[PDB]
Amino acid sequence: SGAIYVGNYRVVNRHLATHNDWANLVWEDSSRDLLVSSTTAQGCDTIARCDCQTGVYYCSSRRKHYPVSFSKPSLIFVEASEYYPARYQSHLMLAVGHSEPGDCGGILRCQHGVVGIVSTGGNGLVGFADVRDLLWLDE
Ligand SMILES: NC(=O)[C@H]1CCC(=O)N(Cc2ccc3cc[nH]c3c2)C1
Ligand SMILES: NC(=O)[C@H]1CCC(=O)N(Cc2ccc3cc[nH]c3c2)C1
Numbered sequence: 001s002g003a004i005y006v007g008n009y010r011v012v013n014r015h016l017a018t019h020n021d022w023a024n025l026v027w028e029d030s031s032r033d034l035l036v037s038s039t040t041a042q043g044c045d046t047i048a049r050c051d052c053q054t055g056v057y058y059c060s061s062r063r064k065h066y067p068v069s070f071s072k073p074s075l076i077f078v079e080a081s082e083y084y085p086a087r088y089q090s091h092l093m094l095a096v097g098h099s100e101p102g103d104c105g106g107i108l109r110c111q112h113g114v115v116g117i118v119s120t121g122g123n124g125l126v127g128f129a130d131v132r133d134l135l136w137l138d139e
């Protein structure tokens, strides 16, 4: 679990969105595993606007933060799960690191701010849904 709170927006993994997220829906993209909902209270998380390929992510299944080198956002095949059939997930970045399904929502940050959230993993990999291209989150 986990979310990004920026301005009047809440960014979550689409597969973990709640009834309240869907009732206040702003945008969603199944191919990216992202959903953004509106909030009444202002958030002050900062989104990175950069091309960093290193950062640190929070891993809830270890209660620890880990440094990572990750790939640029790209279209990657993701095997079927109980939430999606087998498909290409877009805007996904991979890195070597520990992740389990419940780690989804952990934030990846660089020195500029929030880069994305954990969305995939397995066998010593961790995949993050990028949010740096969503410029409208800042307005
Ligand atoms: N026309 C309708 O039936 C909609 C209109 C807008 C609307 O908020 N709902 C209720 C609702 C809310 C969240 C969720 C998640 C899943 N289903 C939901 C249903 C019903
Ligand atoms: N973005 C997706 O399509 C997700 C949807 C929810 C989901 O359970 N998965 C499989 C998955 C996710 C993380 C991990 C870490 C280790 N094994 C994992 C297996 C894929």
Ligand SMILES: [Zn+2]
Pocket (backbone or CB within 6 Å): 048, 049, 050, 051, 052, 110, 111, 112, 113
């Ligand atoms: Zn950066």
